[PDB]
UniProtKB/Swiss-Prot annotation, chain A:
Protein name from the UniProt record: Insulin B chain
Shown part of the complete sequence: 25 to 53 of 108
Lineage: Eukaryota, Metazoa, Chordata, Craniata, Vertebrata
Organism: Sus scrofa
Organism superkingdom: Eukaryota
Length: 29, 21
């Protein structure tokens, strides 16, 4: 699921799955 | 940044992990 176009909520969801308990930052520029 | 460049190009795990805390 990581090796593809990840737009909008798709990216947030991949960050969420990848980062697990670390969490992540989502910064659209 | 990733938000733009992982949507216009395909993403990778290298890139995603760079945005984990």
């Amino acid at each position: 699921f990581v090796n593809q176009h990840l737009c909008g909520s798709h990216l947030v969801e991949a960050l969420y799955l990848v980062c697990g308990e670390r969490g992540f930052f989502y910064t659209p520029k | 940044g990733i938000v733009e460049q992982c949507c216009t190009s395909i993403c990778s795990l290298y890139q995603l992990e760079n945005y984990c805390n």
